[PDB]
Amino acid sequence: TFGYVHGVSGPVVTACDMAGAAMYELVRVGHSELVGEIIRLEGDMATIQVYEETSGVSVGDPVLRTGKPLSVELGPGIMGAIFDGIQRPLSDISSQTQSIYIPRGVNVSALSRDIKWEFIPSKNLRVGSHITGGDIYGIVNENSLIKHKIMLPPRSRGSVTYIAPPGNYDASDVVLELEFEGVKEKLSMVQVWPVRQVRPVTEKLPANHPLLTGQRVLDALFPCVQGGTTAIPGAFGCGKTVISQSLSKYSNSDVIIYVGCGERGNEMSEVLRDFPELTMEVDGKVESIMKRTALVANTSNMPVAAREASIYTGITLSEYFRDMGYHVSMMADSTSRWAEALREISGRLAEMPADSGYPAYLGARLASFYERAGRVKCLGNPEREGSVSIVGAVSPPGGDFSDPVTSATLGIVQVFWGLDKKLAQRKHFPSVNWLISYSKYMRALDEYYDKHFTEFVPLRTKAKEILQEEEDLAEIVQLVGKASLAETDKITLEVAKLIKDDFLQQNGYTPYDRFCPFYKTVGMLSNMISFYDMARRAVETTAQSDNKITWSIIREHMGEILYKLSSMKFKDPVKDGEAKIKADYAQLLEDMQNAFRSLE
Amino acid sequence: YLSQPRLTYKTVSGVNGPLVILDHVKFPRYAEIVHLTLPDGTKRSGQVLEVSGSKAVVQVFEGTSGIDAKKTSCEFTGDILRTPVSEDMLGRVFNGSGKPIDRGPVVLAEDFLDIMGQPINPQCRIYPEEMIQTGISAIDGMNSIARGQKIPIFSAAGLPHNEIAAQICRQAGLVKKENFAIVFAAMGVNMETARFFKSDFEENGSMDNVCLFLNLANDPTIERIITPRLALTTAEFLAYQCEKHVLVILTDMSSYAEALREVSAAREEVPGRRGFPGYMYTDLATIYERAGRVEGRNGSITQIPILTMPNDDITHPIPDLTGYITEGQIYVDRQLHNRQIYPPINVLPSLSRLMKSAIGEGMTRKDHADVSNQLYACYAIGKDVQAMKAVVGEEALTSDDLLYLEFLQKFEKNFITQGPYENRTVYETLDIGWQLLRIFPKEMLKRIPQSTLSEFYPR
Amino acid sequence: VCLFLNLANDPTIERIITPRLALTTAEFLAYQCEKHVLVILTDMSSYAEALREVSAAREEVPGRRGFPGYMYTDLATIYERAGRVEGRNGSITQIPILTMPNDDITHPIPDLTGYITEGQIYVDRQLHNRQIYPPINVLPSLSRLMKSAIGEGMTRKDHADVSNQLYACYAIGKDVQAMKAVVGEEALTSDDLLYLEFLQKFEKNFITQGPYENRTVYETLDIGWQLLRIFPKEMLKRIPQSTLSEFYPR
């Protein structure tokens, strides 16, 4: 039913005749149907925080009470879509209204009802068969790349009374009907879910499998796990573009979700102008990753409730795909700007300001949001595993990690990649700092490496230890100069520079190593650490002799080997197959063995 | 069109500061405009600050002095505030609320636009691309502005940020390697400075392009609140409907934020950080983010907010939030000003996050990015050497360091220093840059590629 | 073991009562069933912030950093449900765990917990980043019932002196490090070098410990003596002669 507006003071509208309204329900205020959220009740009145500008609302304006809290509409048509945080489809608003503005109080259906989809019912299901929350009663052929799986809503169950035969249907068609305790329920391809309620899962599981990014520095030294959580400092010259695009194009994530959560205007324009242009190879054909990516993108002048709802809308879409059993990867583009949206809403509500001005519950909200991540055994009958990997960025003030948003983010998250404008300046792409960066999933992933890449773990330890050693050898050089270092630590320095320049450095625009498979990465680091150990052996076993070996001897004697190691990059996975690259690296190992032996 | 006749109430039930409370109002609108007649015949506008039931709280633009119950009448205009927009207002000077103050006619509207406008659809916004040249070398060469960028000129109280703004207004234009328009909007500008703007633009021939809004320091602070929105509404008309590249120069956004504070306190909200409202971020965003290029329309809106940073504290809410929303910063610097350099634009902390789109072949010239990088590097190394000189002494300096000191001198004296009425195209700024970079032999210009050094360096 | 779980996304206001459920079960087991109960309360920071959430919604008078004015009383209502009772064989040890925000021990949660509890075991980033385990930075740690829980006939009779001397030597070693940060190795005298040697061997031998290593109190005291022997007697100013002459030599 309708209430009526009884007051308006800025965004705070006060509505009478709303006896039954539910707290935190959404309402459509005014003749233009501006969105508002019931932030309070009193008697039979209600206070409605109107998201959009209230200029022009008048006393007596009808208030249409939406039946559901801030919710996302989940169904076919999400993929390739662009949404404001409130789930307003911008790529349909602009097209339908032929205007560059978001009409005040627009009411475009989030998922188009007009477009027909191809629906194939689950062959086993029939009338009378029992069906439970999360079951897949059919598949919608959304794309060449995402076979959408139509699922019963959680909290819905019963006996099948009608299942539509295979054919063309749209979100408006009742595709299934089920019966429970005699009560009947009709289900179309589109369900609804509150953005602030965690979608249920049969069982969460330990994050256990690598999230490949194709970047060597990320996949080797600082892994994230499908279902893990990550942080990325966002800055001007750092180049978060690299991580976002690597996850979108080359990650093993079956689906990608982006969140803007209040970017700058033109900064968001860049993302929306780029992402459609990105492409991925699938089954030997070039495909646009917008067949597997959805963008909750919005700028800073959009409603504050839109910026704050962006994180939750994104994570709810990602949980929908997780439930279907895909390995979603959800990237938030500034949780600092989302946190400022939160601070603004708290200020509008006049809550007590907590640490450094942010609300009392910023830490709890961040904790719950990231906790929504994870690798789960999805609900429902067809056994499935999905995941949602939250790679949300955070924007410290000038690199100061002490502000509440960054500090809580680094306390909650388990991986942190620390992109560095200084390395970008030095022309080191990726700009991963490899000293501030860290990954807490290494213990969890030892299980996987001991199965697939048995020899990667010692190489990881040794590489990080080499680089940490160099961190002090540099100060030794400053104190007494490079000529003053023992030969062993000279070898440390030259191999560390080799790793910096030809392992951790990866030009992302080349064909050969835009994407670096993990077998190639472990092979590269294996050969480099083999050289390190062999040089250390050569120096250490001749320290007891007059024929003591030196870095100068090693370089002048093995320049070919050093050039080969430096060139290991160019081995192209697309043309030089796995077997060929493995054999080439093993041949490099053979040549290096022979060279060290002939020196010895 | 609104046919129905307006209701005029004598039912004033209170007058509390800048607010007049009217009761028994029929279906009040929020943000409705009101024209209220004082007992003595005077007239004052007001905006319905709040509404509840049969009550309406009218923020009278001018003070409430002389208002009373029982004799003040209050006509309700039945609609929100709307600005009349045309091209005719290109080449006019208006006060804070759209009233002409150049002794011209009242604007004959081509349309009536709601001054709050709507947010540009992020899926319709486009990347800025080509350059807007301001003539001021210190920002054309080193901090160029792409069409659609929002870049604020930070400055402390007393620095010539107003003079720099006037120079930008008088000189700006397309790179012309004629559909350009300017919307100046002075908020809280004292009478002498407002007169400076008006007479300067009138005298230096630029008035054909410039629509100038003035909210004098002693005009109503609500008119200050609505001035930036009038400016930007005209800018949106001239850009996304008349398809001409607009440059919006909002002046003293600190004086705007003070008016925002006054209106909040009038609403009786509790203060946020440093006394400013909590929603100042959304509000400043609503002002700034009415900018940028839009797909399918050959116009755009560039902005150059100008900020008086209190206490020179870059952490203060105004500059902090403005940095969050905008895409750069141009520092007007007190040490340069005291040394009597103009424009005292300190190019070391200044930045333009979208300069990389406004330069290059076909937009300014092949060597723009390289010359900018090299000038920045040599300027910074020169500042380093100048700090070191006083410690080690001049004769302890190497010849290269003397080259850098000479470059520092001539960069602060020939490139940064411009004089108010000297207009340098971007090409001229680049050639001055080269005349400075030739202080060094080519091998020292390490950030310039050889393919450029060989082409431009000689002569 | 009897677990109560309020995971990160479970309701916030329920954390207010979760500690009280846990301590009520602990009291039923200890004071009526006579078990020796050890209570753990994980992330009393995540509790105090639930407290701040409710108190803010109530608009109660705030203390420091927005936390309610009565957080001391509430934290004490939790903590002071510990100790042993006359005539009842059970006990309720408590080991609250709390995340000090920004590692700032002046933050209201750690500060009030310090005023209410009987000590604190302080876990240190400047050691965890060096990969010492456990990273217990003893210098700000405290245990108010050590003074009576140690001595003759309970553990050993050197325990108090050994502990006090290790505290003093550790403190002076830290001060010597802070001094060499200014004046470099050259300016240090042999006594400062002795203290730095003690500090190194203390963080390497005494603090550093296997995650599954179970050192007896006697082993810990003997390892303390191996370090006190780094010094000549007269630099062990906190230990009296009767103690020194018996334990120092061996």
Binding site: - | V270, P271 | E59, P62
Partner: peptide
């Protein structure tokens, strides 16, 4: 902030007391 919030609440209560 707390003092001003308290004053505002007391003014609201005064409105309720008067009306």
């Amino acid at each position: 902030f707390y003092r001003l919030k308290k004053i505002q609440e007391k003014k609201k209560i005064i409105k309720e007391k008067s009306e």
